[PDB]
Amino acid sequence: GEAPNQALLRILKETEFKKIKVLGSTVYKGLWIPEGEKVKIPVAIKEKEILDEAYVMASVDNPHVCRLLGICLTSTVQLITQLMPFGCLLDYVREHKDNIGSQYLLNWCVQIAKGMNYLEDRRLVHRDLAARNVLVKTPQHVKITDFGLAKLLGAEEKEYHAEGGKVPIKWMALESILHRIYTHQSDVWSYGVTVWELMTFGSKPYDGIPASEISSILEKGERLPQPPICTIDVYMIMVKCWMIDADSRPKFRELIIEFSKMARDPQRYLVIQGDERMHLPSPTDSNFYRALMDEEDMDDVVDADEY
Numbered sequence: 001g002e003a004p005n006q007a008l009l010r011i012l013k014e015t016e017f018k019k020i021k022v023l024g025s026t027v028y029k030g031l032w033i034p035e036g037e038k039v040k041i042p043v044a045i046k047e048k049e050i051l052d053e054a055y056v057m058a059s060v061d062n063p064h065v066c067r068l069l070g071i072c073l074t075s076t077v078q079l080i081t082q083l084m085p086f087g088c089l090l091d092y093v094r095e096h097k098d099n100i101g102s103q104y105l106l107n108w109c110v111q112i113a114k115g116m117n118y119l120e121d122r123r124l125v126h127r128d129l130a131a132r133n134v135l136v137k138t139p140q141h142v143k144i145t146d147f148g149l150a151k152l153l154g155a156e157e158k159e160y161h162a163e164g165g166k167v168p169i170k171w172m173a174l175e176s177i178l179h180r181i182y183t184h185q186s187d188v189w190s191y192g193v194t195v196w197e198l199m200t201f202g203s204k205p206y207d208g209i210p211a212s213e214i215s216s217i218l219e220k221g222e223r224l225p226q227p228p229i230c231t232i233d234v235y236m237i238m239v240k241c242w243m244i245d246a247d248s249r250p251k252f253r254e255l256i257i258e259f260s261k262m263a264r265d266p267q268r269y270l271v272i273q274g275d276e277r278m279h280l281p282s283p284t285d286s287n288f289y290r291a292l293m294d295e296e297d298m299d300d301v302v303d304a305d306e307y
């Protein structure tokens with residue numbers, strides 16, 4: 001029981017949207033033009049459980065998390081958000097398997113963990129983290145989305161018990177599979193899987209194995225394998241995320257740091273054939289920040305903004 005959520009739910013008129021085109025099953029492309037303000041805000045449009053998803057998206061503000069611009073009540077309920085032009089990261093990495101480099105992959109890892117740590121501070125358990133629910137604003141800026149299964153926790157409450165509903169098994173932590181328990185530390189597990197998804201350029205977890213065998217696979221000790229491009233340093237972290245003890249997994253704030261240190265020297269932690277040739281994103285604020293210090297300190301210098 002925390003502070004009054006004082007977020008503003010904004011109701012939007014049908015007459016403000018223009019040039020609506022479909023994306024698939026429902027979500028749409030579109031343009032929002034607020035009352036005669038003469039500006040175009042590109043938007044996505046998704047068509048009472050949906051009103052919970054709205055409450056959440058309405059209530060979150062952070063550079064690596066999608067915010068609801070508003071809802072629309074005409075005919076049926078519609079969620080309006082900023083259009084992310086490059087779509088979901090899962091499709092993006094598949095689409096650019098042979099054009100993605102090591103700096104990008106590590107930059108996204110940081111950005112996601114940055115978003116998730118935020119959600120942890122707001123007491124939200126996402127419950128459906130995966131590369132499909134990470135979207136691309138620009139190639140070097142990704143955001144977390146899709147709070148359809150998200151749940152808020154009390155100040156008191158540490159876990160969330162589920163009543164039975166469809167959840168993707170191959171991202172789920174073991175406690176979630178066996179005991180229907182959800183915690184920030186189960187989202188950590190899912191984050192590990194998401195990193196595995198990126199480091200294998202959009203491969204399918206446990207490809208071939210059905211969902212029924214999963215709980216029993218993980219009980220036996222087996223995990224996802226070490227991606228070819230991953231040094232033991234990176235794989236270690238993934239495996240740490242998939243540990244049986246929820247409290248022994250990394251913590252999203254720790255994951256920021258671990259991945260941020262690697263991002264200084266991506267070619268030391270990922271070995272991508274043709275990485276010399278790949279396109280590089282803009283230097284990170286952190287990587288810039290560090291070069292401005294004395295050479296003696298730079299070994300261990302950390303940008304406080306990621307701490």
Ligand SMILES: *[C@@H](CC(=O)Nc1cc2c(Nc3ccc(F)c(Cl)c3)ncnc2cc1O[C@H]1CCOC1)CN(C)C
Pocket residue numbers: 023027029043044045046079080081082083084085086087088089090091132135145146147
């Ligand atoms: C991934 C395809 C994909 O994600 N496409 C896509 C989504 C999207 C969203 N998503 C969204 C989710 C929840 C929600 F409440 C709202 Cl309001 C939106 N949001 C904005 N823009 C999006 C764009 C988008 O795509 C782009 C590519 C073509 O042009 C748009 C496939 N997995 C689902 C498997």
Ligand SMILES: CN(C)C/C=C/C(=O)Nc1cc2c(Nc3ccc(F)c(Cl)c3)ncnc2cc1O[C@H]1CCOC1
Pocket residue numbers: 096099100101104139279
């Ligand atoms: C992440 N990497 C794997 C690939 C990097 C891709 C990238 O930067 N792409 C793309 C970058 C684009 C870009 N960049 C840009 C940058 C700085 C600026 F100031 C301005 Cl004004 C523009 N501007 C316009 N279209 C683009 C389309 C891209 O890609 C489309 C077209 C074909 O494939 C998808």
Ligand SMILES: CN(C)C/C=C/C(=O)Nc1cc2c(Nc3ccc(F)c(Cl)c3)ncnc2cc1O[C@H]1CCOC1
Pocket residue numbers: 098099274276277278279280
């Ligand atoms: C920064 N440096 C470290 C290297 C730069 C790399 C780079 O730009 N790469 C690559 C750049 C690409 C590019 N750039 C582009 C830029 C401006 C434009 F107006 C237009 Cl139309 C296109 N467009 C399409 N594919 C590309 C593939 C690249 O790399 C792939 C294909 C070969 O191996 C990996």
